[PDB]
């Protein structure tokens with residue numbers, strides 16, 4: 001734990017939060033996936049622009065005054081929606097204002113369109129998502145936990161920019 005960056009994943013149920021966490025930390029995809037009970041953790045150590053960082057990534061259910069303990073100390077946040085279900089992207093702003101009720105204004109937040117491997121079912125055009133990120137100063141990437149496309153880039157990018165702030 002040279003420096004340990006706590007990151008929280010948030011977003012509605014079944015957007016792929018847990019599988020995202022699984023593919024980044026252990027490189028595996030839980031097909032047999034159940035809704036997350038409580039909060040689960042997973043760490044990974046990587047070196048961002050030349051300084052070894054430990055990420056300590058928190059995960060919970062999309063569904064208890066545990067929110068404050070959930071967000072406490074988070075210096076990063078992945079706002080995940082499900083590219084194929086427009087209702088997941090719509091209440092991302094509602095996750096966003098909860099995430100800013102319980103964190104610092106300078107947290108590094110990436111909006112994430114997960115499941116980009118389901119190309120024939122995409123219900124969210126990337127320019128409405130890019131518009132929402134522009135409007136809110138969010139980073140943004142499309143990802144597939146199933147294919148691993150952009151998962152590492154999503155996390156390391158967050159980690160790198162966290163590093164630039166506190167370095």
Ligand SMILES: Nc1nc2c(ncn2[C@@H]2O[C@H](COP(=O)(O)OP(=O)(O)OP(=O)(O)O)[C@@H](O)[C@H]2O)c(=O)[nH]1
Pocket residue numbers: 011012013014015016017018019020030031033034035036060061062063114115116117118143144145146147
């Ligand atoms: N095709 C495809 N399916 C995915 C992808 N990521 C997740 N899924 C599926 O979507 C379902 C939800 O996965 P989870 O990671 O458990 O969903 P979640 O966001 O963690 O939901 P909660 O933990 O209950 O809040 C699972 O059945 C996955 O198989 C993806 O990238 N591509």
Ligand SMILES: [Mg+2]
Pocket residue numbers: 017018019034035036060
């Ligand atoms: Mg889960």
